[PDB]
Amino acid sequence: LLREQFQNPSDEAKPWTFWYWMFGAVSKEGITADLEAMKRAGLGGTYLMPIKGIKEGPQYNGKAQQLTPEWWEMVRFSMEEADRLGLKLGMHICDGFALAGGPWMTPKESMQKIVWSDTIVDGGKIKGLHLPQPEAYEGFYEDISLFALPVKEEAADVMPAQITCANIATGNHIDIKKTVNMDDAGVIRSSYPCYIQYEYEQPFTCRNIEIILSGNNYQAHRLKVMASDDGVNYRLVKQLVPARQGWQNTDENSTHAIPATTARYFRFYWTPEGSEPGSEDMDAAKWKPNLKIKELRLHREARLDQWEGKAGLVWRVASSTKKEEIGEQDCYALSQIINLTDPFTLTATLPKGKWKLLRMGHTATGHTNATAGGGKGLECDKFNPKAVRKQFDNWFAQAFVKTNPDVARRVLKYMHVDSWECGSQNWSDTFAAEFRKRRGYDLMPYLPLLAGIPMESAERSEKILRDVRTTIGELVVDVFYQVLADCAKEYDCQFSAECVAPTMVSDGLLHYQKVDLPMGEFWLNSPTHDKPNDMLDAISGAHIYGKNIIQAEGFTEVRGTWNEHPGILKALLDRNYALGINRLFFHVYVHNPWLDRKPGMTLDGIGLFFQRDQTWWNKGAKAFCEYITRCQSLLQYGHPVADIAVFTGEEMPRRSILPERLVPSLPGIFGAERVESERIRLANEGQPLRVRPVGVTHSANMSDPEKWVNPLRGYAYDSFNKDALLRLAKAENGRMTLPGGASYKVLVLPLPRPMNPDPAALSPEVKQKINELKEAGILIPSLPYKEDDFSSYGLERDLIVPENIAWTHRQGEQGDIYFIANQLEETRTFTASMRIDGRKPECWNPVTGEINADIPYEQKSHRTEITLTLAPNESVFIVYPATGLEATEYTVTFTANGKTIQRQELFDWSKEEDEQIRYYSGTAVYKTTFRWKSKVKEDQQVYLNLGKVCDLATVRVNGIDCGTIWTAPYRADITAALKKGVNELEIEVTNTWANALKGADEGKAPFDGIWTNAKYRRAENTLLPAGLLGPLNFDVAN
Ligand SMILES: C[C@H]1[C@H](O)[C@@H](O)[C@@H](O)c2nnnn21
């Protein structure tokens, strides 16, 4: 019975929280208080992750520094308390929130990259020549190969040049100080159209431009390169193209190839016009459209376009290099290169002429788990099974040894890996052998490709580099993930994992096959830091690899301002349920070690502030968690339904596809109005800015996941990869099926897109599997698909609802479930039509738990239609089996500071003269009486409507609890509690911390004990409305 699960949910259905210990400031008192608070809210467990240590926050006097006996004692006490209370625990595989580092790791055991040095020497009899040492992270380096290259031309790779600049932005409403300029350090800055000019003594032949930045700068990659011989007639060379890039893009410079150009003068023209708005695969374009360049280096030696990325040193995608840029003349044949490893100071004999001595080897990338404290150190080598095992043994395994082994064996059931923040890597000591087994040929002779030196042809080079990247991503799965999965089963743990993309070269779906619990992430009020693409990686991964529980780190808030409460979290949560998550993890519960300070310790103001010292914790968090649990009991039932699978291609890196990127492929499915708004948005005219949250200025045409509810207008889709196609896909009854229950009718092979611009050719195997699926009846539409839907092919929309209604559909042996959620902040009445023929629908309310088994419905064209009224932000589940107030005076007690006042009229606290009410945050108890004339009749239902509630209210009538009201409709069923005559009305109203913190900031604190390390505040500088504002009314229905 689904009803037993909805009314009595199982433990799997409960939401969890991340629990962050800050700066080693931890106490047993606070531990007990936190774990009891979590139990009281109805949480299932917590992930215990310490962040930073004493050194990073000396002011807090921490005594529980990571890995000290005192810290381990606190971990033990937490396990003991979680055992007592019936909570489960997880921990991360390292200290801090990312990723797999620790002080036990040496440079040799860390993430490795290919490095090199060179010198030009005359050939002949070389004896005892000392070659320059390549990059050696903390002295660690190891040679791999030494190559001898014949010199192409004989001139310097770079020459000196006189650098000038000029503003050209005319249309004079301009701030003259923000026009182009070069500072003392040679750094170039501009906000306005301009050019930077380089004048050489003699004509210089340039084939590429290395752009060197100080942090990220989208606009630096948008320069238009021009050249001249005579200083006035300038010819176009190339409009540069930004590579796709994530947020961790500063480990390498960027090389832009150009057609070989010989000139005395080069100009780089810039304008902000034509900028793409920001996204997760052009992270730098989220920021202000200002130009900032540390150095442009113009080079002579041929290099592949955007080679740093193509070599796998950083996560990047760009087009193959054109033949106009790298012709066969520009590439070295294998027979031209002499391999001098064996001789290697160097003593050997080369032919005559001049030779380049490319000394190649490997060193650490230098990445650490930087948010750790006592457990901080180098990131483990991600391709080395032993280093990965070692990392497991030294942190996570130790929680079963250093605490209390029998208690740890019962409560510590979850091992987590968060989202990658340790860059990329492209070598390890097993990498040549792995490449050979997997790709079927030897990489070693082609090692100079990893320096972007072209060999044989531009195409052969880039085909090989793609293979390197493919191997890289395969090894993240087959080593790092495989090893941790084995370790997890060995310790009887479930394995949760977040995204690898867009920081480590990877197929972003691929690793989810190895984990029990794929985990996405969604942010609150943080468009610059939100990760909708991560969400779709985790969901798509779970769906294609058959993982039924999909966790999500939810409500992460880049700057929390203390005005947040469950009411304004609901719509955000509901649209992520619509995407397919079904176990929320709250981000974040911060341990507050002091019982006398509130709201206390935070992650330096990064929200959501989800913890015991919230004004609304005791009643608000519990009510919300009840909603969540009921929602999740049903959203974990059976299998998700999606009719459309979309192939993610054969470029590397790769990941799930965002809805926006499919609009030119399926313009019909999205509709003409979506096509039109995308063209306006992407044209990004004037590069408009928005500030959200306070102090975060960014591109206003950023794709906003709130504007992409139900984007395929009644269908759902998963991204789907080569591995799933080749290893798992089956045709059954006209649909493509996978183990775990995915069944798709349609397979979209998208048009070339930003993340797959070539696009990479389909391998013969893929072509062969696609053809088998065409023949077994699977729709593989011709693109662009221009019809409104797939009903011409007998595939109707699953749910027809109006815009701004989020939904999902699950199906199992006991029937069908549609989750339907209003995203607008208004009451709406609308028809929902479901693809269900001849079964009786019911309406199950996840806020109250009420089940209405007898709703009206029509049956038309073999669908079922229902009329729904949804209050602001209201959600429902559709399940298919297989008169004013006349009150006496109010007594209002403000419990935090004991004030009590009498009032006839309801009032906004923030408008009172008394500063202890004006600035009050917390709970106030309202007490009054009312007359009810008649006895409550049969079939008759009575609601106390609260009107406007700031922000949360618990209703007691004649001492009977009639519920905690936190979202619309703001009303309480008082039917069972009503008596004839005089009724007693008690209402507890709770607001948010914002007003009290504003009071405390200004010396007008409404009570003592107010402190937090969270410093961010709303820009508005206003007191929020607060209280039972009403008006109060009764509603008598049937
Ligand atoms: C706030 C932390 C958060 O706690 C972590 O999940 C980490 O993945 C991250 N990425 N950006 N910001 N964070």
Ligand SMILES: [Ca+2]
């Ligand atoms: Ca994360």
Ligand SMILES: [Ca+2]
């Ligand atoms: Ca493709």
Ligand SMILES: [Ca+2]
């Ligand atoms: Ca794309």
